[PDB]
Amino acid sequence: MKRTYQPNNRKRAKTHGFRARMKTKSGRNILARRRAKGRHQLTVSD
Amino acid sequence: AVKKYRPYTPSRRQMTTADFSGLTKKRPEKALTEALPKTGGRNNRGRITSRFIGGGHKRLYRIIDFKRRDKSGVNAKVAAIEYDPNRSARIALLHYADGEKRYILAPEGLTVGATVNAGPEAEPKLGNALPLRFVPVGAVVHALELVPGKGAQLARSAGTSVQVQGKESDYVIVRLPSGELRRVHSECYATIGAVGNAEHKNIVLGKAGRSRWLGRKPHQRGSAMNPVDHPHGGGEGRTGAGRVPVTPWGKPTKGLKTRRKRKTSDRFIVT
RNA sequence: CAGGUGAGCUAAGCAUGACCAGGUUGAAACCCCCGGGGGCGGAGGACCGAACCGGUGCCUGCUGAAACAGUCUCGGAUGAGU
RNA sequence: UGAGAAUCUUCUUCGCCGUAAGGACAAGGGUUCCUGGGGAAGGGUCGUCCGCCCAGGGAAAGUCGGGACCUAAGGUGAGGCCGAACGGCGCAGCCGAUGGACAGCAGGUCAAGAUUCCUGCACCGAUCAUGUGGAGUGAUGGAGGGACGCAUUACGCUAUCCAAUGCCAAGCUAUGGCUAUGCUGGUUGGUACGCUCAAGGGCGAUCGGGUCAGAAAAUCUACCGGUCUGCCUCAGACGUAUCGGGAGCCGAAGUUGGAAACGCGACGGUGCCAAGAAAAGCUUCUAAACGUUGAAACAUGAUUGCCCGUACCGCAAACCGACACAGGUGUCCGAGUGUCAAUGCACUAAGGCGCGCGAGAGAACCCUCGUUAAGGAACUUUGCAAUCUCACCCCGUAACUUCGGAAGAAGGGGUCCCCACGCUGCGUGGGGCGCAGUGAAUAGGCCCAGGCGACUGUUUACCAAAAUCACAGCACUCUGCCAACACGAACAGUGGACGUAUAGGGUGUGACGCCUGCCCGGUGCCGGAAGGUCAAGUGGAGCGGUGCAAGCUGCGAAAUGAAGCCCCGGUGAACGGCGGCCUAAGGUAGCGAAAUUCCUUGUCGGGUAAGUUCCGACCUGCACGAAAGGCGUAACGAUCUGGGCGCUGUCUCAA
Ligand SMILES: [Mg+2]
Ligand SMILES: [Mg+2]
Ligand SMILES: [Mg+2]
Ligand SMILES: [Mg+2]
Ligand SMILES: [Mg+2]
Ligand SMILES: [Mg+2]
Ligand SMILES: [Mg+2]
Ligand SMILES: [Mg+2]
Ligand SMILES: [Mg+2]
Ligand SMILES: [Mg+2]
Ligand SMILES: [Mg+2]
Ligand SMILES: [Mg+2]
Ligand SMILES: [Mg+2]
Ligand SMILES: [Mg+2]
Ligand SMILES: [Mg+2]
Ligand SMILES: [Mg+2]
Ligand SMILES: [Mg+2]
Ligand SMILES: [Mg+2]
Ligand SMILES: [Mg+2]
Ligand SMILES: [Mg+2]
Ligand SMILES: [Mg+2]
Ligand SMILES: [Mg+2]
Ligand SMILES: [Mg+2]
Ligand SMILES: [Mg+2]
Ligand SMILES: [Mg+2]
Ligand SMILES: [Mg+2]
Ligand SMILES: [Mg+2]
Ligand SMILES: [Mg+2]
Ligand SMILES: [Mg+2]
Ligand SMILES: [Mg+2]
Ligand SMILES: [Mg+2]
Ligand SMILES: [Mg+2]
Ligand SMILES: [Mg+2]
Ligand SMILES: [Mg+2]
Ligand SMILES: [Mg+2]
Ligand SMILES: [Mg+2]
Ligand SMILES: [Mg+2]
Ligand SMILES: [Mg+2]
Ligand SMILES: [Mg+2]
Ligand SMILES: [Mg+2]
Ligand SMILES: [Mg+2]
Ligand SMILES: [Mg+2]
Ligand SMILES: [Mg+2]
Ligand SMILES: [Mg+2]
Ligand SMILES: [Mg+2]
Ligand SMILES: [Mg+2]
Ligand SMILES: [Mg+2]
Ligand SMILES: [Mg+2]
Ligand SMILES: [Mg+2]
Ligand SMILES: [Mg+2]
Ligand SMILES: [Mg+2]
Ligand SMILES: [Mg+2]
Ligand SMILES: [Mg+2]
Ligand SMILES: [Mg+2]
Ligand SMILES: [Mg+2]
Ligand SMILES: [Mg+2]
Ligand SMILES: [Mg+2]
Ligand SMILES: [Mg+2]
Ligand SMILES: [Mg+2]
Ligand SMILES: [Mg+2]
Ligand SMILES: [Mg+2]
Ligand SMILES: [Mg+2]
Ligand SMILES: [Mg+2]
Ligand SMILES: [Mg+2]
Ligand SMILES: [Mg+2]
Ligand SMILES: [Mg+2]
Ligand SMILES: [Mg+2]
Ligand SMILES: [Mg+2]
Ligand SMILES: [Mg+2]
Ligand SMILES: [Mg+2]
Ligand SMILES: [Mg+2]
Ligand SMILES: [Mg+2]
Ligand SMILES: [Mg+2]
Ligand SMILES: [Mg+2]
Ligand SMILES: [Mg+2]
Ligand SMILES: [Mg+2]
């Protein structure tokens, strides 16, 4: 009974990846929003 | 002489299929088929535009010569009439005296190997590309230009014909397949005669999917949609009221053309 | 209401690859004897039935083995297929 | 073993999967791999054990996958087109495998890696040297080719499996027998070389002309004319050698007959229509340039061979399901016996496992089951469920029909063992055994008659699969090509469509058959456009301020101003209407107690002992009706309704 999470590394990083977020002002906003919150992770890149 | 079937299956009796005997059984021409058709209904932004275009058989384009003006004065031999997807009309391969091969629409008749003559001075044989000026009045012609150069745009579905009528100082009147009486410039080329495979129109599809083989996804009525998706909404039974389409309008009688400069360029008789 | 995040589930499209045991039936066309008989041929959104795809009816399950299943039964099964 | 054992280790039986519950991969996980140790907690009990804790090792590539190559969709994108901003597009080029391209196989082994390492022997490209040759090379450009669908199907062959009184290897046996003709196991992989055997497969061949063809070039392509079975090829087999492996107590044998792939020969043949990528590598040409007494190429030797991945799990206890989860998870291989066939069913090889609480006991009750007197649907909303039917062969099969079908209609018969005979395992006779012969497993209940929908199909992830939806067919209607139509800040760009009226868009009917009547009054729309009305604008005649006045300035008509509406025709496969003891008309066919009937269990007939159901007539159609289609229709349905056969614990009535 198929589940929501089928992992896929190229998909996980093509979406969600730091280079992917940097392409868009929303994603650069996600990046700085995380740097400010001070997360250790910041992206699926880590 | 279209092929038929016995009813060995429930939906095979009503089917019809075209007569391929005269088509030459050969591969399309490796250079003339640039191929590469994407075959998507989704347009530039991925949103459905012409609704219900779907899968079906993959096709290739084969480039067709619509202007037929760079070969003026050169004879051509008809290599082989042959099948083509993406056209209601069959097309004819032809080899030029300088050895160029090129595709064209097939007129009705035209047995393989017939000579054809493009240009201004070429005689009104079947298959020649001619200016409207040299065409005698009342002859059957297809592959009609709307403007000099560019290419043929009128009469190109199977069996369509255009009728020359009178003549002006340059412009020549013609009867379009709708019966529209439109003027067209003297320098427009045309191919004499009617298009080949004249009786495509009588083919019966005979089952649902056979149109899927043509890439036509099922076409829903808006009688079935919920009022969210179509102005023919729910209604607990089945009906209609007001007669409007997807985005609302009039599908039974409404004038839809606009107020273009094209309107003065044809006698008003139309459809 | 605003600006975002999501088609890795699912709803479709596109490009490109792959899969569908076996058995039944015997369309044209082609060839003989007088549309009919014989051969021949191997067509089909044809038949039966595994994978596979799907969920027809009861029952069980009901603080489950499982936040939608299980046994049995059932639909298709070369096509509008997976 | 141990402090402690139903559970950890080993041995011998047992049972369970075996197109898997075996094996190999991809994902994806990340040390879970191996060794030595540990016992808190995680392990549904235990625990000395573990996929858990600790420490330490294991992971090797010029040839496998990717990269240093190519391109599809897609994403980019100097220039370029747009757009309050952020940005949206966008030619070339570039990225981008799921595809194209490309050089090795056989064997061995750590505790743990293997086309990687080692052993044997190959190939690839590159550089250089020696020599032959001793001169032409021959581009981001041209050309060929690479380059492709589906179904069937002929011939050879391999993988691979079967048989034997073929060979080889080892030993026994005993129970009552066999003394081996019995039992068990094995019975070739690679490479090199052949005047060895070989289906199948490919390919014609130059001379010349024309410029108008490939940008120009061209000795290469295309066009055009003249000119005469054969070559090439090995799939695979056979021999010699060799190098391995090889049952076994270091190394034996390697035969004969048969079966046989989706694999190989091949890019085979044939049929079909829905008409089936691109690009570089590659082959061939010249342009420019470099030379034409240190060429292209070939032979040998030497030298060089970069990056990333490879452990382990990988239909699952190591991935997705919060779990050591009955769930799912793409590709490949998947033996034998029997059974028409098969990846089916039953048993089993290899291999793998008994599902991480156990032991008793044999109450009620509950779940999955086996048999059941007599009766047989009486049960009940309904035969729901459970019987019954069951595979193959022979015989035989209706109303109806679109002539194809209904059809596996129905119904009856055979089925096992032995012997003789005939034919190529069948048929022919005979005999035999049981209750019984598809002996166990898998393996249709059928008929009559309706309603609805023609049909295959599609659907509400997780209470509805249908009479819904779609469907071919039909109809209206639009749209002349920057087409109507749609996405869109957009004279951007796209889709329609590299389509052009036999096409494209919308709407509704929904195969086929006979058909589809009346009513333009309202509403819509299409035409007309004498007249009515109608904005800004043009006009500014006049009515007023304020100044001594020039002048400045607030209002401001008439006429003239478009579409559009009022008005006038028409249009129904436009929205619709076709009735109440005047409205535009008032129901053409067909049907009718309907899926439509309130009164209603309508009346009569049918069928049952008994029929609110059901079927056929009637018509009083509350409240049918003609492409929101009317009347039929063969075939079809996990569709609904009524009946009958058959058999059943559904039931009498439970044991
Ligand atoms: Mg889930
Ligand atoms: Mg990283
Ligand atoms: Mg339609
Ligand atoms: Mg609805
Ligand atoms: Mg609406
Ligand atoms: Mg409505
Ligand atoms: Mg209704
Ligand atoms: Mg719309
Ligand atoms: Mg079928
Ligand atoms: Mg049938
Ligand atoms: Mg479904
Ligand atoms: Mg069935
Ligand atoms: Mg001790
Ligand atoms: Mg203890
Ligand atoms: Mg011992
Ligand atoms: Mg496995
Ligand atoms: Mg990985
Ligand atoms: Mg271990
Ligand atoms: Mg250990
Ligand atoms: Mg412990
Ligand atoms: Mg414990
Ligand atoms: Mg254990
Ligand atoms: Mg490496
Ligand atoms: Mg090596
Ligand atoms: Mg590679
Ligand atoms: Mg872009
Ligand atoms: Mg790519
Ligand atoms: Mg690949
Ligand atoms: Mg290779
Ligand atoms: Mg060792
Ligand atoms: Mg190993
Ligand atoms: Mg196939
Ligand atoms: Mg024997
Ligand atoms: Mg040369
Ligand atoms: Mg396969
Ligand atoms: Mg390139
Ligand atoms: Mg491994
Ligand atoms: Mg790893
Ligand atoms: Mg869960
Ligand atoms: Mg599990
Ligand atoms: Mg097999
Ligand atoms: Mg087997
Ligand atoms: Mg067998
Ligand atoms: Mg089985
Ligand atoms: Mg395992
Ligand atoms: Mg166990
Ligand atoms: Mg039971
Ligand atoms: Mg009984
Ligand atoms: Mg009886
Ligand atoms: Mg009763
Ligand atoms: Mg019943
Ligand atoms: Mg019911
Ligand atoms: Mg039942
Ligand atoms: Mg009759
Ligand atoms: Mg018949
Ligand atoms: Mg029968
Ligand atoms: Mg007897
Ligand atoms: Mg008998
Ligand atoms: Mg039996
Ligand atoms: Mg049984
Ligand atoms: Mg239906
Ligand atoms: Mg069916
Ligand atoms: Mg549901
Ligand atoms: Mg359901
Ligand atoms: Mg434009
Ligand atoms: Mg309808
Ligand atoms: Mg009644
Ligand atoms: Mg009734
Ligand atoms: Mg009806
Ligand atoms: Mg009665
Ligand atoms: Mg009745
Ligand atoms: Mg009607
Ligand atoms: Mg209907
Ligand atoms: Mg039937
Ligand atoms: Mg169905
Ligand atoms: Mg019944």
The span from the CA of A2 to the CA of B58, in Å, is 32
Rg (C-alpha) for chain B, rounded Å, is 22
- Token output for B142: 């297809």
User: Residue type for B271, please?
Assistant: T
Could you please report the per-residue DSSP string of A20-43? HHHTSHHHHHHHHHHHHHT-S--S
In chain B, positions 164-223 with C-beta closer than 7 Å to nucleic chain D are: 176-178, 180, 182, 198-201, 203-211, 213-214, 216, 218-223
Phi, psi dihedrals of residue A31, rounded to the nearest 5°: -65, -55
The span from the CA of B81 to the CA of B177, in Å, is 24
Could you please report the per-residue DSSP string of B114-131? -EEE-SSS--S-TT-EEE
- Token output for B170: 């340059």
Domain boundaries, chain A: 1-46
Q: Is the C-beta of residue A41 closer than 7 Å to nucleic acid chain C?
A: no
Residue B204 CA: distances (Å) to CA of A6, A40, B23, B30, B56:
46, 67, 20, 32, 18
Q: Is the C-beta of residue B212 closer than 7 Å to nucleic acid chain C?
A: yes
Quoted resolution (Å): 3.4
- Token output for B164: 């020359």
Please, which residues have CB within 8 angstroms of residue B135's CB and are 6 or more apart in sequence? B124, B141, B164, B172, B190, B192
Q: Is the C-beta of residue B228 closer than 7 Å to nucleic acid chain D?
A: no
Instruction: Provide the CB-side half-sphere exposure for A11 (13 A, CA).
Output: 4
Q: Is the C-beta of residue B8 closer than 7 Å to nucleic acid chain C?
A: yes
Q: Is the C-beta of residue B133 closer than 7 Å to nucleic acid chain D?
A: no
Q: How far is the CA of B25 from the centre of ligand 57 (A)?
A: 72
- Residues whose beta carbons lie less than 5 angstroms from ion ligand 1: A 3-4
The span from the CA of B121 to the CA of B133, in Å, is 11
Nearest residue to B171 via CA among B183, B182, B179: B183
E-strand ranges in chain B read 75-82, 91-96, 101-105, 115-117, 129-131, 140-142, 144-145, 152-154, 162-167, 172-175, 181-184, 189-192
Cβ atoms of residues B114 and B158 within 8 Å = no
Q: How far is the CA of B198 from the centre of ligand 50 (A)?
A: 73
Q: Is the C-beta of residue B4 closer than 7 Å to nucleic acid chain D?
A: no
Rg (C-alpha) for chain A, rounded Å, is 12
How far is it between the farthest Cα atoms of chain B? 71
The span from the CA of A32 to the CA of B86, in Å, is 53
In which residue are the tokens 């009705």 written? B108
